[PDB]
Design an enzyme around this catalytic site. Sequence first.
Site, PDB file in Angstrom:
ATOM      1  N   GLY A 192       0.784  -1.315  -0.147  1.00 51.71           N
ATOM      2  CA  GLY A 192      -0.073  -0.120  -0.169  1.00 51.71           C
ATOM      3  C   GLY A 192       0.752   1.357   0.053  1.00 51.71           C
ATOM      4  O   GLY A 192       2.027   1.250   0.223  1.00 51.71           O
ATOM      5  N   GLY A 218       0.599   5.930   0.591  1.00 49.03           N
ATOM      6  CA  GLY A 218      -0.334   7.091   0.890  1.00 49.03           C
ATOM      7  C   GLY A 218       0.623   8.333   0.750  1.00 49.03           C
ATOM      8  O   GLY A 218       1.843   8.230   0.007  1.00 49.03           O
ATOM      9  N   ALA A 219       0.392   9.573   1.401  1.00 50.83           N
ATOM     10  CA  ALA A 219       1.251  10.648   1.188  1.00 50.83           C
ATOM     11  C   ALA A 219       2.732  10.550   1.617  1.00 50.83           C
ATOM     12  O   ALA A 219       3.575  11.077   1.293  1.00 50.83           O
ATOM     13  CB  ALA A 219       0.477  11.971   1.851  1.00 50.83           C
ATOM     14  N   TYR A 220       2.724   9.970   2.815  1.00 46.55           N
ATOM     15  CA  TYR A 220       3.975   9.770   3.582  1.00 46.55           C
ATOM     16  C   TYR A 220       4.918   8.573   2.898  1.00 46.55           C
ATOM     17  O   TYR A 220       6.293   8.680   3.480  1.00 46.55           O
ATOM     18  CB  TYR A 220       3.909   9.724   5.131  1.00 46.55           C
ATOM     19  N   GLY A 221       4.381   7.680   2.266  1.00 49.65           N
ATOM     20  CA  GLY A 221       5.186   6.847   2.239  1.00 49.65           C
ATOM     21  C   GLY A 221       4.691   5.581   1.213  1.00 49.65           C
ATOM     22  O   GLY A 221       3.417   5.377   1.019  1.00 49.65           O
ATOM     23  N   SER A 222       5.423   4.906   0.578  1.00 48.54           N
ATOM     24  CA  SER A 222       4.988   3.440  -0.318  1.00 48.54           C
ATOM     25  C   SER A 222       5.515   2.378   0.586  1.00 48.54           C
ATOM     26  O   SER A 222       6.577   2.239   1.084  1.00 48.54           O
ATOM     27  CB  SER A 222       5.505   3.654  -1.618  1.00 48.54           C
ATOM     28  N   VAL A 223       4.911   1.100   0.574  1.00 46.06           N
ATOM     29  CA  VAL A 223       5.224   0.041   1.005  1.00 46.06           C
ATOM     30  C   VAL A 223       5.155  -1.290   0.276  1.00 46.06           C
ATOM     31  O   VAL A 223       4.349  -1.282  -0.493  1.00 46.06           O
ATOM     32  CB  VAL A 223       4.414  -0.376   2.503  1.00 46.06           C
ATOM     33  N   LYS A 266       9.567   0.243   3.521  1.00 50.13           N
ATOM     34  CA  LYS A 266       8.776   1.410   3.429  1.00 50.13           C
ATOM     35  C   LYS A 266       9.684   2.551   2.763  1.00 50.13           C
ATOM     36  O   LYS A 266      10.855   2.808   3.171  1.00 50.13           O
ATOM     37  CB  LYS A 266       8.351   1.837   4.385  1.00 50.13           C
ATOM     38  N   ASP A 310       3.078   1.357  13.737  1.00 50.68           N
ATOM     39  CA  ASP A 310       2.124   2.558  13.213  1.00 50.68           C
ATOM     40  C   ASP A 310       2.174   2.465  11.665  1.00 50.68           C
ATOM     41  O   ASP A 310       3.489   2.709  10.985  1.00 50.68           O
ATOM     42  CB  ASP A 310       2.669   3.863  13.666  1.00 50.68           C
TER      43      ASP A 310
HETATM   44  O1  LIG Z   1       5.564   1.394  12.436  1.00 47.56           O
HETATM   45  C1  LIG Z   1       6.369   2.330  12.250  1.00 47.56           C
HETATM   46  N1  LIG Z   1       7.224   2.606  11.158  1.00 47.56           N
HETATM   47  C2  LIG Z   1       7.402   1.693   9.987  1.00 47.56           C
HETATM   48  C3  LIG Z   1       8.802   1.237   9.869  1.00 47.56           C
HETATM   49  C4  LIG Z   1       9.069   0.426   8.966  1.00 47.56           C
HETATM   50  C5  LIG Z   1       7.916  -0.129   8.085  1.00 47.56           C
HETATM   51  C6  LIG Z   1       7.693  -0.985   6.802  1.00 47.56           C
HETATM   52  C7  LIG Z   1       6.619  -0.999   6.774  1.00 47.56           C
HETATM   53  N2  LIG Z   1       5.707  -0.192   7.454  1.00 47.56           N
HETATM   54  C8  LIG Z   1       4.352  -0.277   7.379  1.00 47.56           C
HETATM   55  C9  LIG Z   1       3.619  -1.025   8.550  1.00 47.56           C
HETATM   56  C10 LIG Z   1       3.872  -2.369   8.147  1.00 47.56           C
HETATM   57  C11 LIG Z   1       5.225  -3.059   8.932  1.00 47.56           C
HETATM   58  C12 LIG Z   1       5.245  -4.423   8.585  1.00 47.56           C
HETATM   59  N3  LIG Z   1       4.664  -5.011   7.674  1.00 47.56           N
HETATM   60  C13 LIG Z   1       3.582  -4.531   7.154  1.00 47.56           C
HETATM   61  C14 LIG Z   1       3.134  -3.188   7.325  1.00 47.56           C
HETATM   62  C15 LIG Z   1       6.408   0.393   8.343  1.00 47.56           C
HETATM   63  C16 LIG Z   1       6.214   1.405   9.620  1.00 47.56           C
HETATM   64  C17 LIG Z   1       6.161   3.442  13.519  1.00 47.56           C
HETATM   65  C18 LIG Z   1       6.530   4.826  13.029  1.00 47.56           C
HETATM   66  C19 LIG Z   1       6.569   5.709  14.161  1.00 47.56           C
HETATM   67  F1  LIG Z   1       7.055   6.983  13.791  1.00 47.56           F
HETATM   68  C20 LIG Z   1       6.148   5.122  15.552  1.00 47.56           C
HETATM   69  C21 LIG Z   1       5.827   3.944  15.717  1.00 47.56           C
HETATM   70  N4  LIG Z   1       5.465   3.530  16.992  1.00 47.56           N
HETATM   71  C22 LIG Z   1       5.623   4.672  18.077  1.00 47.56           C
HETATM   72  C23 LIG Z   1       5.140   4.309  19.497  1.00 47.56           C
HETATM   73  O2  LIG Z   1       5.407   2.945  19.775  1.00 47.56           O
HETATM   74  C24 LIG Z   1       5.284   1.949  18.909  1.00 47.56           C
HETATM   75  C25 LIG Z   1       5.868   2.455  17.385  1.00 47.56           C
HETATM   76  C26 LIG Z   1       6.189   3.069  14.572  1.00 47.56           C
END
Ligand SMILES: O=C(Nc1ccc2ccn(CCc3ccncc3)c2c1)c1cc(F)cc(N2CCOCC2)c1
Length: 351
Positions: free
Chosen positions: A28, A30-35, A50, A165
């Site tokens: 997925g 959005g504005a702040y990033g691609s995953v 990301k 998050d």
């Molecule tokens: O989760 C965070 N960032 C992050 C980093 C790397 C990846 C890679 C993919 N995603 C999207 C989510 C995802 C992860 C894995 N698999 C699928 C989707 C990222 C997101 C994130 C960011 C923040 F600013 C705070 C917290 N918090 C702050 C408070 O405490 C908890 C951590 C977590």
Amino acid sequence: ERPTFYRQELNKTIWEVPERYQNLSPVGSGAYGSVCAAFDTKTGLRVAVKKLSRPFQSIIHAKRTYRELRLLKHMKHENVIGLLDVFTPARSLEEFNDVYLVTHLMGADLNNIVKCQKLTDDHVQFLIYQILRGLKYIHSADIIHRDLKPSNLAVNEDCELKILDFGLARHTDDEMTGYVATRWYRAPEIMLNWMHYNQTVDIWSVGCIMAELLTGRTLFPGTDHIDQLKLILRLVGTPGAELLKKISSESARNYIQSLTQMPKMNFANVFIGANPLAVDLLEKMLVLDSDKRITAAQALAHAYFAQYHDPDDEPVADPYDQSFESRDLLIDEWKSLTYDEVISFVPPPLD
Ligand SMILES: O=C(Nc1ccc2ccn(CCc3ccncc3)c2c1)c1cc(F)cc(N2CCOCC2)c1
């Protein structure tokens, strides 16, 4: 030492990543990033990568980029997202414009757990215990999540849970308007800006989640901010004298005293059939006055979790220097700070 990078276009995005990452596929954006999902050939882990979108386009964006990396590099806990890697294709600061972050791949969140399976009291015990254990850790570093909802909790097949998050866009007025999961888990004081908020905002969100695991349904599915406040006050009762005083928003405070006074309801008659200890804990989480809410540390010592509580395996976080949050700097300054953190990253013990 610098890896070899390869390029690939995916949904009109140029992904430049090290060769270790293969089988890239969009999850997925959005504005702040691609995953993307990928396979890490070095660790053998299915990972999420990301790519941050224009991480240095303004002061706000630059500071946000720096903030996330500082957060992610600090968080080292079983029940909180771990940073597996961070990288940039650029060979110097001059050409430093892209940042990528890597962590373990989720797939299943608590949202799909709650919709698509039967949850026993013992499952609820275990899931909330792990939210509070992560939360004790992060609150110990004076980190507030502020957006805890079921879509930010990863749950594997063994029912092991991580707080992350997955926010890829901004937290705007429109994103919080109407009948939306985006607002249903927010403490009332941040939803209506009553006051300077504290880390017990996150405890309110746990209570709404715990309740939803118990009943299978949203606790406060407001159609708008005020309908949501009515749903809340109906359950927990309208503010008394002491809480109102603490609401600095004169505007917020006058709207409240227009409401007809209501007592807190009997939680045993809302949460029918539930462990009396669950009900008790919920009564301590779902308290209008944030000063009086149970903390994560306190909640871990509650009878409801006797099966799991271990005071020698509920760690706190190392000190986390957040002085940068008061700091005013230029895009280029935030960028070099960010660059230093990229270059200085050490990956966690393999693996
Ligand atoms: O989760 C965070 N960032 C992050 C980093 C790397 C990846 C890679 C993919 N995603 C999207 C989510 C995802 C992860 C894995 N698999 C699928 C989707 C990222 C997101 C994130 C960011 C923040 F600013 C705070 C917290 N918090 C702050 C408070 O405490 C908890 C951590 C977590």
